[PDB]
Symmetry: D2
Subunit: 202 residues, 4 copies
């Protein structure tokens, strides 16, 4: 087992995917600011970025039966770069998607809509993987970025469900029912807030 260059391979990945996050963050910040400038509403509440830790990446590769290599990771793992866009209201989610995908150097790679089709546990979010060019010192990389788009309420719910799920399944089955209740109650109140906000901005 002499392969130390596999480790260098993953260190490169961390560096270039971190740069992809900066490119998309800047795009999103500009969209939010311009929309606010025109319509006096910020669709984005806040954003969170993370590059997948190498340990988490190797486990995912193993989980999926894939080789433990950077070439394989770059080809088959689409969430090495992840950004979470937390929006103020439900309709902001799809506004953000539309504004970003219109851009000529952003290509849609994968789309999963858990808002129209929530997961069994009650999870909601719009997930889009997009590619963006990253201009490095001596080459260009076109890299995927996984964007999770959700409301404040979806994010509150997901953070709590995550914390339960990441402490064994015994506990994740007491709260299953009550967590579903919460997801639905969050859905209902955000619908009302959205309804009010739409009327006062006609």
């Amino acid at each position: 087992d002499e392969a130390f260059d596999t480790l260098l391979g993953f260190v490169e990945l961390d560096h270039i995917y971190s740069s992809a996050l900066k490119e998309i963050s800047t795009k999103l910040s500009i969209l939010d600011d311009n929309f606010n400038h025109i319509y006096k509403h910020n669709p984005i509440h806040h954003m969170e970025r993370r590059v997948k830790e190498m340990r988490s990446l190797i486990e995912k590769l193993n989980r999926k039966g894939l080789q433990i290599s950077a070439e394989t990771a770059k080809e088959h793992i689409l969430d090495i770069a992840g950004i979470r866009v937390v929006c103020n209201y439900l309709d902001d989610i799809y506004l953000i998607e539309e504004m970003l995908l219109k851009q000529e150097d952003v290509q849609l790679i994968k789309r999963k809509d858990y808002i129209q089709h929530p997961k069994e546990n009650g999870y909601r979010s719009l997930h889009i993987v997009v590619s963006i060019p990253v201009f490095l010192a001596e080459r260009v990389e076109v890299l995927p970025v996984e964007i999770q788009i959700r409301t404040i309420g979806m994010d509150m719910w997901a953070s709590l469900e995550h914390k339960i799920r990441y402490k064994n399944n015994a506990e994740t089955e007491k709260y299953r029912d009550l967590l579903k209740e919460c997801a639905t109650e969050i859905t209902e109140v955000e619908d009302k807030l959205q309804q009010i906000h739409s009327e006062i901005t006609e």
Copy 2:
């Protein structure tokens, strides 16, 4: 020599420094609670120094002289910080942790969580003083801290947007906003109860 009250520019400078002092304290508390218990009580923070426009209006509203000296004496929210927390009990955790510090003095406390306003507003308001070390002197300045949950914050942002138009028009939503505040309260109570159980 007319009312060249430059003093208000001085106010903005030193109250902005007080905000940096308190923000640093809060960030350290959040980081350390996370280090020990694996939970961040703070979701995010927002700071603002009261604009001179709003400040003069408040002084007039209260029948006070239009001067920086009078503002520093009578207006406790020139420096404001908003601490948005993840769960209801984080609000009181943050308060307890800040007031334990030896260079933090409590000046005023209003808890609109235990006693919500008529329209449904909820938040814990504490005014504290902190020392600010300047180039040639020390100032002990008040800072208004609004501590609230994410849910309370969403509600307040929406209600604020209503009130800040022709304020007469669009008071039909009073009833429906109150419903939302109650519904947010109930869901956050349930989230809090779950979070308490899985963390002992």
Copy 3:
């Protein structure tokens, strides 16, 4: 309806966005050069959008109409970024790396390093355009990039502070500032020569 030229507020908004686009590009280049060669060519960066006050004066100075449309057409430094580099050759490294990018177009180049101004000023100035993706349209906007070493920057900050008083008074230092520029040049040449040797 008098000259409610709100247009200048529009200008500030979109040229500020262009600055974010270029800054992100430069930061990524610096990070990657460091990753490969273990050197950061960038020491730090400073951004500013030209104030409306200065902008109208420039339009008047050039005999141009006082309008945002005219400003966007004729003023190439509404958005300015200053890239302060660690060594002299970093200046040209940064230029080469930026101009290689396919969505960056060169508009104008003035090299006051190869041809210093009379007072001793030195810097590389390149105006480039970049696309800015807004909510409902694309804008291709010029950005003035001043690229200089740390030594050039120290000199310029001091000279700027002189010129920006009663500008008639304090022109005795012209001679002594020129000496400093030459002395800074000579030391930075020597630092550069050492740095080149220990990095092959």
Copy 4:
């Protein structure tokens, strides 16, 4: 060798010394901004913070003959938290020191002045270790912070000398003489800039 708790000890150190850096950074930012507000000069050009990496800390402990433990590190290693304050002009260095040490919760612990007494290789900087209180969730720590105060020119010189020194002594002896020349030439030009700046701000 079961001591895994030694590693936890050092992880605590990183966390609390990082907090000490935030406290001192905020103090310094406020001083610079207030001085600028009054006198229209920013004495600070920029600041750089770093918490010593655990590897570097263990090597220093070994170099000094000290036990490999967090208690020992906290007692005997004064640069776990380091901040570098780069100033615009020479006199700014001592202004910053004076303004900071006047504060009632800052105590001077150690002072080494390589400006009045430069090192043989030509290194210049004012080094002060100070203590500051850090208010944590359940306790207070009074922690040292090593502050390196220097001009822009001293910093340019030190960065280059560092890069030479950290590639074997063979090369660090060709440039010794020329590096001394540079340090002196930087000293002389900054004296002139300082002299001009003093006259135009009388």
